[PDB]
Every structure is written in C-alpha cells, then in structure tokens.
C-alpha cells in the first residue's frame, strides 16, 4: 500500500519540485489547508481511518503539531482511488514552513501475521515525510 499526497494551501498546489507558496495577503485571514490523497494497494471496499497531521517545520529542523484531523473513508475499485482531508482555516505564521503527514489504518483486520489464515492485524500505510515538497507550504513574507 502507498499514499501519494499533494497539499493545497489557500488554493496553491504543492509539488515535488516546489512547496505551496501562500501570499502574505492570503495569510491575513488564515490559510485554508486541504490535502489530496491518491492511494494504491489497499483492499477494495474496505473502510480506513485516515489521520492527517499539519506540522510546523521549525528553523532548527524539528516538528511541532499544529492540527490533526481524522476521517472515515472507503477504498474504491481494486483498492486505488482518491481521498481528501480538510484542515480548514489554520492561523499559520508569516515566514514559516508547514508539512502535512498522512496515516491510513484499516478498520478491519486485513493481514494474517501468524500463518493461521485468520486475519489478525490492520493494514497501515503512512506518508510522514517532512522533506516532501508536494506536502509542504510556506507563508510568504510581505
Ligand atoms: Ca487565507
Ligand atoms: Mg492470523
């Protein structure tokens, strides 16, 4: 299983090549942060708990949690498709960088870990990459 994720910050797409740059003017009423999640290799029609976390990337490189959202979502045909996670309006700081992490965990046991053909473990897929610019936004200075 894989999650391939792109952030939208006040309407600005992140990409692997360029963080989502939020204009100073757009930062004044906060920053609307939405994540888009393309998943593959999940179990078709199974329910997952998707947890997204918005992390402040501090000048020293460490991370601080700003917001966390959970949503009940369902894997589509052949266990691939698209989900969304809306952080809503976040009061982010001018000049600062933020990154979105995602974690998908099946509601049901979908994996046999003890060779008894009884499914006993949830499927877990994570994208927790502070160096992924597609999941990163920066609030521009004036
Ligand atoms: Ca705004
Ligand atoms: Mg088992």
Numbering used by the authors: 446 to 587
Paper text:
Central to this ability are non‐canonical covalent intramolecular crosslinks between protein side chains forming isopeptide, thioester, and ester bonds that impart remarkable stability enhancement to single adhesin protein domains or are involved directly in covalent adhesion to host cells (Alegre‐Cebollada et al. 2010; Kang et al. 2007; Kang and Baker 2009; Kwon et al. 2014; Lei et al. 2021; Miller et al. 2018; Pointon et al. 2010; Walden et al. 2015). The autocalytic machinery of ester bond crosslinking, as first exemplified in the Clostridium perfringens adhesin Cpe0147, shows three residues (D577/H572/T450) arranged in space to mimic the acid/base/nucleophile catalytic triad of a serine protease, with Q580 the equivalent of a substrate electrophile (Kwon et al. 2014; Schwarz‐Linek and Banfield 2014). Two buried and protonated acids, D480 and E547, act like the oxyanion site of a serine protease, polarizing the carbonyl bond of Q580 side chain to increase its electrophilic potential and reactivity, and potentially stabilizing a high‐energy tetrahedral intermediate.
The T450C protein is found predominantly as non‐crosslinked and disulfide crosslinked species under non‐reducing SDS‐PAGE —this scenario is detailed below in the SEC‐MALLS and X‐ray crystallography results. Only a very small proportion of T450C protein forms the smallest hydrodynamic radius, crosslinked species eluting similarly to the wild‐type protein at ~12.5 mL and with a thioester crosslink confirmed by mass spectrometry. A close inspection of the mutation site shows no thioester crosslink with the C450 thiol group sequestered in the pocket otherwise occupied by the methyl group of the wild‐type T450. The reactive sidechain of Q580 forms hydrogen bonds through both Oε1 and Nε2 atoms with the protonated buried acid, D480. The position of E547 is unchanged compared to the wild type, pointing away from the ester bond position and making a hydrogen bond with D480. A wild‐type, non‐crosslinked model was produced from the T450C structure. Geometric analysis following the method of Du et al. formulated for serine protease characterization gives an attack distance, d attack, of 2.65 Å measured between nucleophile Oγ and electrophile target atom Cδ (Du et al. 2025). The attack angles α attack and φ attack are calculated at 104° and 89°, respectively. In this model, the close approach (2.65 Å) of nucleophile threonine Oγ and electrophile glutamine Cδ, and the perpendicular relative orientation of the side chains, are consistent with the geometric arrangement observed by Du et al. within 1000+ serine proteases (Du et al. 2025).
